[PDB]
From a paper:
Cohesin entraps DNA inside its ring-shaped structure, which at its core consists of SMC1, SMC3 and SCC1 (also known as RAD21 or Mcd1). SCC1 is bound by either of two paralogous HEAT repeat-containing proteins, SA1 or SA2 (also known as STAG1 and STAG2). Cohesion at centromeres is protected by Shugoshin (SGO1), giving rise to the typical X-shaped structure of human chromosomes. SGO1 protects centromeric cohesin by recruiting PP2A to counteract cohesin phosphorylation by mitotic kinases, and SGO1 also directly competes with WAPL for cohesin binding.
Here we present the X-ray crystal structure of a segment of human SGO1 bound to a conserved surface of the cohesin complex. SGO1 binds to a composite interface formed by the SA2 and SCC1RAD21 subunits of cohesin. We determined the X-ray structure by molecular replacement to a minimum Bragg spacing of 3.2 Å. An Fo–Fc omit electron-density Fourier map exhibited clear features of the SGO1 peptide. The SGO1 peptide is bound to the CES binding pocket. The binding mode is similar to that seen with the YxF motif from CTCF.
Residue numbers in the entry:
A (entry chain A): 81 to 254, 260 to 438, 455 to 505, 511 to 839, 849 to 959, 964 to 1048
B (entry chain E): 331 to 341
C (entry chain B): 321 to 394
The structure:
Amino acid sequence: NMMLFEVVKMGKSAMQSVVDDWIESYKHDRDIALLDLINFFIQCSGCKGVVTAEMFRHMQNSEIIRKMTEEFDEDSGDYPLTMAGPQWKKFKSSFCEFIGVLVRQCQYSIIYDEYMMDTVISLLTGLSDSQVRAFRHTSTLAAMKLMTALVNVALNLSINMDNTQRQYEAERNKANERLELLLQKRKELQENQDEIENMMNAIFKGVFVHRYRDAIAEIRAICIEEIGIWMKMYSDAFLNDSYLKYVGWTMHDKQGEVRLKCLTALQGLYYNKELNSKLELFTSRFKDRIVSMTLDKEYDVAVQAIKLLTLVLQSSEEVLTAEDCENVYHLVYSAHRPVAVAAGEFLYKKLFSGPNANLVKTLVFFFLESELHEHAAYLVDSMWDCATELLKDWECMNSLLLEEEALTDRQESALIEIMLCTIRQAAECHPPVGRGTGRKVLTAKEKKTQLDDRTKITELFAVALPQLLAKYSVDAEKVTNLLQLPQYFDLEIYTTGRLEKHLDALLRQIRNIVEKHTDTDVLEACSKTYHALCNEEFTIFNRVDISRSQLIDELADKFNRLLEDFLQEGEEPDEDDAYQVLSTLKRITAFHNAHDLSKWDLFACNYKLLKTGIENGDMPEQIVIHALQCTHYVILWQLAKITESSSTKEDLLRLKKQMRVFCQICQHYLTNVNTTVKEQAFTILCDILMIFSHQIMSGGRDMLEPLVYTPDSSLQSELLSFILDHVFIEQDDEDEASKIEALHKRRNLLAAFCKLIVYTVVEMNTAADIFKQYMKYYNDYGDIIKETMSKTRQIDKIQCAKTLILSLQQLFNEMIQENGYNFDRSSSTFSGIKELARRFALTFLKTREAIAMLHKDGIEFAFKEPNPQGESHPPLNLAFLDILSEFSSKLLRQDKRTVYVYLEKFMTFQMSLRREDVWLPLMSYRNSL
Amino acid sequence: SNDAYNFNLEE
Amino acid sequence: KRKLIVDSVKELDSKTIRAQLSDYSDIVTTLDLAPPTKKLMMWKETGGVEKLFSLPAQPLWNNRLLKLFTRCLT
């Protein structure tokens, strides 16, 4: 009835209670009970029809199923097993538990009465042949959940017949009429076994072999999942090629959910860890497919292929080739962390199996042999979870770099990189960029371990870092990495530990590095390290403050001496002289970024340098770019100090002259022919122009009104001109890594200008020359332009729309200069302009005034220029109308006719009487309204 | 049996 | 006509199954490597429109200065 199906969806019951209640009904009347059961399977398909006693007695299953299809009386296409929500997932569980419990509770008597099982198998083996998906998905599930129950029964039977065989041979070896009864029990049990096989052979041949190849993947995944279960539970009987092959073929299925269940089902046969010989022969045939699935289009399947392959390492034979293992190793560098750590486990097991000395060396050789990544951040992240024993053994690493086969230069360089990221990921207890999921909060145990490790690192390397620096003081790569540890130290340990001696040693090593190395990144680390250590809230400030002031005193005095001769009017300096000037300028520039060097007043020093490059045109580019940076930092650090209302009044006005003349200086160098000089002037200008924008005042900072600076038309054009010449360039359609880095540079420059657009330092009309590049440069700059389009729409939608049409007006104008006025409206170029307009249209409450103004402008632009030869002949730009009709879809009903009266002021009636080709723009626009 | 898996002979 | 879902094709031809066995190129792909250079790593965290439109073009390494720029956002 409704009752038996209802009982199962919200049972909150021991399904054994339902089964046992049913079995008792079966004993009182078999046919009444079976009819309840037949119907139960039919309502589990959402059927709503009822099988009657009459049907049960005289109708074949084929006829019943047909009658149930007609009487299905569905409200929709859904059926129980396709509903969403936990409550319905619980129904599926209840559905499967009832089937399994029912069989198992009957396994000792009822199941052999040649009536129940056969009747259910028949209905289910025919509902699984139905074109009605509901009847087929549901019956196929039930059939597999019945087979697995009958696999359990045959297993018990096999167990009990072995026990019976044991007692029989026991009685014979050592009373005769017991031997007779024991053999009649062995006869009975074989008769039982044959009946269970017959049943199983009819749910396999009648359902499986026909539904593992269903078209509904959810029905194919059901079948593969459960064959895996049979081979796992009754390995002796089902784990052979005759059953494995179905998983072997179906892992070529084109649906990921099905491929997944194949791997799962095979993982279960390997987690057994019974080292099966027949499974070993299957995996030789399908080894190559399984390895390839590590790069399955679905990452979830790829994780399981890797994990299956790690369990294959237990296999007695060497089944995987060298090639296979190296393809897995590469995946430690994958973007998807689930894949990377699965490969990490593979790497760990296969190759990892002080004491850890050679373990560390092997990791270094692996990293060097894997020519895919230059850093080890991702390598470390891949093995944080498994090899945490090794990656945090800093005593072993520090000793490998000092205490005497040896380590090569490349190996010491890689060991420093590896060690650096292990320290990074331990201090900042989170993964590298691209491997994390939104920085989830840490366990109490995790936070403890963050503490435990940070003291270990600080204790050790506060002593050892001075030693490493001294040994590798000459290798840039090595020192650039080493100088970044301080940012993770625990500042209070430097005092509690009586370590002031090592800090002095460190500070001296840094100074000798500053004096010798010029690598822009070596010097960046030195400056950021000093900034990290110059925290006024820790006990070591005045110590590091003293060494810092000593360092700048040397550099500033040397800088004066150098400039007094470099700029002496007759001492035409050569390359050697220039490199000396550049080496000190770089050091001053790096430190002036992170540190307040206002006291040394370097503003005039660089001004004389820059104006000389203007007058003579002879100045090395590296000198110019770093003088540009240092001046930028000089100005900003003053702007930071003048915040104080308790401040000198002359200084603030003095600054306006420091900034105003700097803008014209940069504007001059923006026209220079050297590219890196242009880029540098452009970036500093876009930053300066934002820092000094009107928004400098908002947060109660009304003092700074005199500092506001607004650019000229000349400057705005020069800035835009740079974007056109350096950003929107010919495109292809030194290989990837470099070409990505080049793109990111151009994106920075593009974002720099767009910041000025969405913040109204420049007229919004400038954005037209950008907005017209949306589709042409979608992949490269699409996201930046869309953000500019969104921010501008929020500020000024009518001005946004006015600039959008201007973009299309310019695209139109470009085409007439290239193709000609008599262009083809079917051209691919004209096609793209109006599709660009169609996307523009979806960016449209106050949308009424904007779309209206857009048509007013687009109309003027169409009729702006008249024809040379004829008023009855067409205006020149009239074809623009068909572009503008891409917008009318968005227009309101009310203003469509108002726009027409406006259009009639422009169009004479002879024109509106025109229908010829050239005027097909008109009627197309007329059809719009 | 590697003739078992050969789907050219079907199941 | 009926909302009841009826499938015209139940099984998948043996011929289509042998094709799946012989060509799985459409269900495997290339390694999507993670930033392979320290600079590309840095460009991922500072990349993206959100970070790009809220941070200076010329990096400022002291937050005493970086503020001076973020002050001026809306």
